[PDB]
Every structure is written in structure tokens, then in C-alpha cells.
């Protein structure tokens, strides 16, 4: 199945979807009539092939001269998030689901673009320094201007946790120069190991009913959860608890036996981790209605994640903020103020109980589940929409 969760990052109206299309052919759709013209809310999904010519996009070597057929390397799946500074929660969720990143910078649009920088920062925070950098709108720029842009980018990427991350000049519309990108996908991104015995944990980003308009109820379908595994091969025929729960104010975890564990385009026996998977469960498709299973944790039955509202956070912050042009000073965190705490996939609205030296105690208005220590990206409301302040770990 899908071997490595590779994410796509860039500015809004630059062409992440376009890039995906160029790579795979699989469309992110762009939907709900708002997003048909403009920008997606959900993650965009695509399945790209790597079968190398060693003597590729398709498993045949008729194209690159030598008739010695395309030698199977990998199959990779995309994690394409919204690159808008309003919808950052989704991006954050994607980030602690990904194994590696793909940057997208346009030629004619500037080098210190705010959103892109923010994305980069997020990636750095959440252990995602494996970034393949792509020059995108180069089918517009001069023989000198492009070079200048590249130089500027290089200059920028000197103090960042990205040091010598590779840059490729592609056209997402004209279909050129993606060979290099493909090569890098095997070269610069090795897949981090993901075993059998590391306790099975599924991180849900999407809720899906496949209940088509027109059918009869004597021919029914269950609930499908679109979520990623980063530990534990889920096999067909297992019982599950989804632990952030269902709301009564108290919450109670949801129990579902596996109908299917579906990856690629064809349903499989297994779901080997480091991939984003559509899990058919006996759970109602009415709870998989639109975007209900977003930021929920799934464990195999006989397991104890903990649903915390009162949290011990170890926090770290910036000197100067991101999301804006206008990079504003980080004023100190203020008590009993609504922050957004992004933990793996959750985007919970939290109130500050205490501020110490490097630790903070937080109240959650919506309960999140901590199994391990859990990776956090933090966010705040200063300029209406949510800006990225810093990062944390749950000290548990």
C-alpha cells in the first residue's frame, strides 16, 4: 500500500492541487461550490507511483529508451492541506500525520511570503525537515529573475532547521522537470521505520458516508473513517474504540468493529503504517456525515488512551510571530484567554490556567486524548483569525 505520508505545502492560489495533478493525475476535486472556484476545506488526496528506470509514473519502460521494464520502488500517498491563514487547523492536523514535506514557491510572487513561512515553521516544529522545495510558477519568469529568486530563497534557508533541502524548478501545468522530484522522493526522503509491535494507533482526519442518494435501505453501507496510522498494522476483523468520545457536560468514547481497512484503490487484508487509510467500521454513516470524525483518536480494543481537559503543557515560543506580512512582536501569553492547541489532529480551544517559566496549565473546552507525550503546535487570536505563536508538549 501507501508507503510514506508525504505532505504538500505552499501559499494560497499558487497550485498545490495543480502540482498534485501533475505528479499523479488524481484530482483533489476542489468542491462544495465555494471551493470549486476558490479553496478546499478538506485534505486533497492522490496516489503516486515510483517504479524506477535503472537499466516512473507508469510501470512500463517503453518511454525512456531501454525496453527493460520499470523496476518497482514504492507507492506514495499525498497529504495536501489548505494553505490559507484562516484554515490552518487542517494544516496542523496534517502535519502530525505526515512523515515528510514538499514545499511550493511561485516565481513571480515574493520570497518572504507569510503563509509559506508559517508552514515552514510548523514543519520545523513537528519534525518534518525532509522538505523537497519546488519552484512552481517559473513558466512566467525571466532567465535572471528566477535565478535571483532562487538565490534569495537560499539566503533565507540558512538559519532555519532546513539546511540543504533540494530545490527543483517545475511546471505543474506544462508537465516538465518532475523527473528530478521523483528521484529525490527516493533520494532525499528515506522512509522512517514503522514496525509491528509499536502499539497500534489511528489518527482520524476525515469522516465519510458512502450512502449514495437514490439507493434502498435493504442495500446499506456503514461508516468509513479517513485516517492515518503511524504505529501498528491494523488487520481485517478487529474491534476499535474512538476515544475523544460522544457528547452528552461529559463525553463517552465510541465503539466500532472493522467492516474494512481500505487503502490505494483496492481494499486490503492489512493496513501497514506510514499511510493514510479509509477504514470501514460498523459505526453509523450518520456520524460519518460530513466532518465529524476530524481530529479523533482510534485504538484497537483493550487499550487505554486518556481523555484530558486539564493539561500540563511544556511550552516554547517565538520572538516575533508568523501568518502576517508586519511580523508582530510576541507579547507574553495572557491568562484565561482562548488559544488554539493543535495536538496531533485536534484543534481544541483552550483557556490558560497558569503561566510559569517554560510550563503552562491549560483548560480544554473540548477534551483531547493523550496516549504518549503528544506533539503540539500552538495558536492565538490577535488579528481576528488564528496566528501561530509557538509549540508545546504534554508533560504526561
Amino acid at each position: 500500500q501507501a508507503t510514506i505520508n508525504i505532505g504538500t505545502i505552499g501559499h494560497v492560489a499558487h497550485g498545490k492541487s495543480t502540482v498534485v495533478r501533475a505528479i499523479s493525475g488524481v484530482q483533489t476535486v476542489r468542491f462544495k461550490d465555494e471551493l470549486e472556484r476558490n479553496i478546499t476545506i478538506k485534505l486533497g488526496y492522490a496516489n503516486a507511483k515510483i517504479y524506477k528506470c535503472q537499466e516512473e509514473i507508469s510501470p512500463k519502460c517503453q518511454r525512456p529508451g531501454c525496453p527493460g521494464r520499470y523496476k518497482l520502488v514504492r507507492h506514495v500517498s499525498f497529504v495536501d492541506c489548505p494553505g490559507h491563514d484562516i484554515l490552518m487547523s487542517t494544516m496542523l492536523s496534517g502535519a502530525a500525520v505526515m512523515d515528510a514535506a514538499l514545499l511550493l514557491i511561485a516565481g513571480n510572487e515574493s520570497c518572504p511570503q507569510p503563509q509559506t513561512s508559517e508552514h515552514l515553521a510548523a514543519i520545523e516544529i513537528m519534525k518534518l525537515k525532509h522538505v523537497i522545495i519546488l519552484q512552481n510558477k517559473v513558466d512566467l519568469m525571466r532567465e535572471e529573475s528566477a535565478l535571483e529568486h532562487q538565490k534569495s530563497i537560499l539566503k533565507f534557508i540558512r538559519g532555519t532547521i532546513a539546511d540543504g533541502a533540494p530545490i527543483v524548478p517545475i511546471s505543474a501545468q506544462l508537465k516538465y522537470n518532475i523527473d528530478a522530484v521523483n528521484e529525490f522522493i527516493v533520494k532525499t526522503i528515506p522512509v522512517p521505520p514503522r514496525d509491528f509491535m509499536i502499539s497500534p494507533r489511528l489518527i482520524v482526519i476525515r469522516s465519510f458516508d458512502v450512502n449514495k442518494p437514490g439507493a434502498e435501505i435493504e442495500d446499506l453501507k456503514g461508516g468509513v473513517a479517513g485516517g492515518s496510522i503511524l504505529n501498528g498494522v491494523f488487520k481485517l476483523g478487529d474491534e476499535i474504540e474512538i476515544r475523544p468520545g460522544i457528547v452528552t457536560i461529559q463525553c463517552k468514547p465510541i465503539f466500532s468493529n472493522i467492516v474494512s481497512l481500505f487503502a490505494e484503490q483496492n481494499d486490503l487484508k492489512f493496513a501497514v503504517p506510514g499511510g493514510l487509510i479509509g477504514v470501514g467500521t460498523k459505526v453509523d454513516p450518520t456520524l460519518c456525515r460530513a466532518d465529524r470524525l476530524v481530529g479523533q483518536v482510534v485504538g484497537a480494543k483493550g487499550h487505554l488512551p486518556n481523555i484530558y481537559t486539564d493539561i500540563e503543557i511544556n511550552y516554547f515560543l517565538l520572538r516575533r510571530l508568523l501568518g502576517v506580512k508586519k511580523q508582530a512582536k510576541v507579547r507574553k501569553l495572557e491568562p484565561n484567554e482562548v488559544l488554539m492547541v493543535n495536538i496531533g489532529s485536534t484543534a481544541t480551544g483552550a483557556r490558560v490556567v497558569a503561566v510559569k517559566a517554560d510550563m503552562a496549565r491549560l483548560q480544554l473546552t473540548s477534551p483531547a486524548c493523550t496516549e504518549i507525550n503528544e506533539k503540539i503546535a500552538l495558536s492565538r487570536r490577535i488579528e481576528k483569525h488564528w496566528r501561530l505563536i509557538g509549540w508545546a508538549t504534554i508533560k504526561k
Partner: peptide, 17 residues
């Protein structure tokens, strides 16, 4: 490195419509 990139860029420039 931005010089195994330079070659790529050159190639791209060569094969534009």
C-alpha cells in the same frame, strides 16, 4: 545544492513551448 538545480533549470528553459 543550487547548482545540480542550475542544470535542471537550464534544461527546463531549453524545453519550453
Amino acid at each position: 545544492v543550487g547548482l545540480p538545480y542550475s542544470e535542471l533549470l537550464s534544461r527546463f528553459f531549453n524545453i519550453l513551448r
